[PDB]
């Protein structure tokens, strides 16, 4: 059943879209990895950071973007496709604010990108961009919001999500952690995320080779934690554990 | 005036389970009367008629367009259009062309297919739906017809008592209107009957 594989619009006899699945395979091909966790009043995203050359600038190399003031995103997948998707999300957020006159809920922004990807999977154009995009934001009524926008058309909302190579182990660890008192504090959520990534990686994190972003019900802005914050959290929290 | 070019007049009222729609018969361009058998009340259903008035070419064209739409709607949605749905359809037809319209004032009169309750409505030349339980007047001599409407109507009205009222009202209104008149056709729609009368008039 490998003949139904060379076009995004031809079903397999068992009802599978192989070049939709291969987009997820590309996600895994991204090499990096990402995780996100939402607490009672905070949302925290943690992500790899590979700098395999002294000349690469850490100021530019980053996979935590600011789609708008209140909404932030972590990418997992090919960098070019990721940045195209980021630009699209910025465009759609701006257009929403312009037309309907209020900041786009994370619900809708993830829905909108999911629908763009769906259009591409149905009409045999583009080449479904291979990135997984995880959005964090603050919603006035429900509270914190963490959503994932896979490159096949799901925009699902998550209590704790993982993307990339270590997605399975990350999901297992996050289930284990969530089953115990999901009401987490700001520092406890930052931990849960960083500890999940560290354990699934079998590594201990330097304060630089990890990118962490956070939003809170008191700070509804996409704060990219600096080297100081990363170091402080890692050292102090691992010590006090 | 564009309306005054070809005159005309349409009226409709409702009584007690009976409705009536009355139109003057005339087609004169400017002042040269051309004929006196011009159809202005058209049947769009078993108990639903449209009394398009105003400019002649626009009247005919709206009739053909609306019959096109209604045939499609009935066949595709097998049913007999309810008067409200016909009113909205006519509103869409006229308002599709606000920037240069059909110069006509539709006037719908009929009975609801299911509950057999009466319905009358009017529309302006751009498509503001107009429903009222007493009268609907359109075309030239609008003022005269409104006067007769108001000053010759009583509620809870029966078939013949409504026949006489609608006749008298339109007869007087159209006799007191240049570029209008010379015969009055009156269509009375009932629960099971429809009567098409050609009453007298000051054809002069």
């Amino acid at each position: 059943s490998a003949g139904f594989d060379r076009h995004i619009t031809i079903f397999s006899p068992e009802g599978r879209l192989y070049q939709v699945e291969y987009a997820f395979k590309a996600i895994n091909q991204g090499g990096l990895t990402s995780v996100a966790v939402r607490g009672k009043d905070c949302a925290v995203i943690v992500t790899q950071k590979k700098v395999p050359d002294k000349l690469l600038d850490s100021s530019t190399v980053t996979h935590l973007f600011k789609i708008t003031e209140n909404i932030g995103c972590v990418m997992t997948g090919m960098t070019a496709d990721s940045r195209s998707q980021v630009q699209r999300a910025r465009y759609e957020a701006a257009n929403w604010k312009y037309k309907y006159g209020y900041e786009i809920p994370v619900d809708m922004l993830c829905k909108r990108i999911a629908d763009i990807s769906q259009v591409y999977t149905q009409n045999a154009e583009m080449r479904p961009l291979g990135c997984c995009m995880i959005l964090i934001g603050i919603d006035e009524e429900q509270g914190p919001q963490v959503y994932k926008c896979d490159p096949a058309g799901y925009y699902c909302g998550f209590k704790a999500t993982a993307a990339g190579v270590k997605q399975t182990e990350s999901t297992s660890f996050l289930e284990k952690k969530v089953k115990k008192k999901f009401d987490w504090t700001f520092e406890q959520t930052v931990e849960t995320a960083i500890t999940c990534l560290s354990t699934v990686l079998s590594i201990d994190f330097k304060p630089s080779e990890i990118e962490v972003g956070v939003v809170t019900v008191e700070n509804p802005k996409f704060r990219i934690l600096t080297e100081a914050e990363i170091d402080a959290h890692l050292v102090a929290l691992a010590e006090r554990d | 005036s564009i309306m005054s070019y070809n005159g005309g007049a349409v009226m409709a009222m409702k009584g007690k389970n009976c409705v009536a729609i009355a139109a003057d018969r005339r087609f004169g361009i400017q002042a040269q009367m051309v004929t006196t058998d011009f159809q202005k009340i058209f049947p769009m259903g078993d108990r639903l008629y449209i009394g398009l008035a105003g400019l002649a070419t626009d009247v005919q064209t709206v009739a053909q367009r609306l019959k096109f739409r209604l045939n499609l709607y009935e066949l595709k949605e097998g049913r007999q259009i309810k008067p409200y749905t016909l009113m909205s359809m006519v509103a869409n037809l006229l308002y599709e062309k606000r920037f240069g319209p059909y110069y006509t004032e539709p006037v719908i009169a009929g009975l609801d297919p299911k509950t057999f309750k009466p319905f009358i409505c009017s529309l302006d030349l751009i498509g503001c739906p107009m429903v009222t339980d007493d009268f609907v007047v359109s075309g030239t001599c609008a003022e005269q017809m409104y006067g007769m409407c108001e000053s010759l109507w009583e509620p809870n009205m029966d078939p013949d008592h409504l026949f006489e009222t609608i006749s008298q009202a339109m007869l007087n209104a159209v006799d007191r209107d240049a570029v209008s008149g010379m015969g009055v056709i009156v269509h009375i729609i009932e629960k099971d009957k429809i009567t098409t009368r050609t009453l007298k008039a000051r054809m002069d």
Binding site: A114, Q118, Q122, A124, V146, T171, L174 | T85, M89, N92
Partner: protein
Amino acid sequence: AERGYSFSLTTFSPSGKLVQIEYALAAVAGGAPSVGIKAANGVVLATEKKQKSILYDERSVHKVEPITKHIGLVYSGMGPDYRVLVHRARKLAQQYYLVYQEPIPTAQLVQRVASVMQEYTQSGGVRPFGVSLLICGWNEGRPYLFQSDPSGAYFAWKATAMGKNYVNGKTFLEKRYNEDLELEDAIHTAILTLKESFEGQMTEDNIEVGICNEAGFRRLTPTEVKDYLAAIA
């Protein structure tokens, strides 16, 4: 067999069969369990909402959505396709509302969504929408339950089920279904037909049920669905 004539959608087969739409229907059947029952005074739709983890916030993506306050829609198949069809169904309903000032009759909404599917199943670079829709509605006074298939085909149902085990669902409904099944019992029948297809415990949060009666289509809240599940169990 007819092997060559299965990679395209503008080429018949010696049997006359367009293989690609049948493949799409296979994709549909390979989806979530969903059930529909036409009660004497209502319609009931249900669909397994099971997630792959406790991580997914199981309140963020619903599966029984409205199209008007007299019509609603549930699905089995894929999900992105479903979102597109729901968006277009709402758009068609509103277009009809503007053109004719009357809430869209369920039959016509079904017909137009079917026409959309037909549009998508008739060109060389459009993948047939792989999803089958159950459309519930209340028009005049008679509840309507329709099924729209990727093939552009729309057909009425007294009660049906679709997904991985539609055969079992339909035999169960055949056993348990009688015309004069008032809504309060139709809900139990739908939930039971979901039970006979639903692995694991049918918690109140992993099942979505929507009921369409005169008052208007409404998706039952977690408290109501939990009450019903406890009553049935």
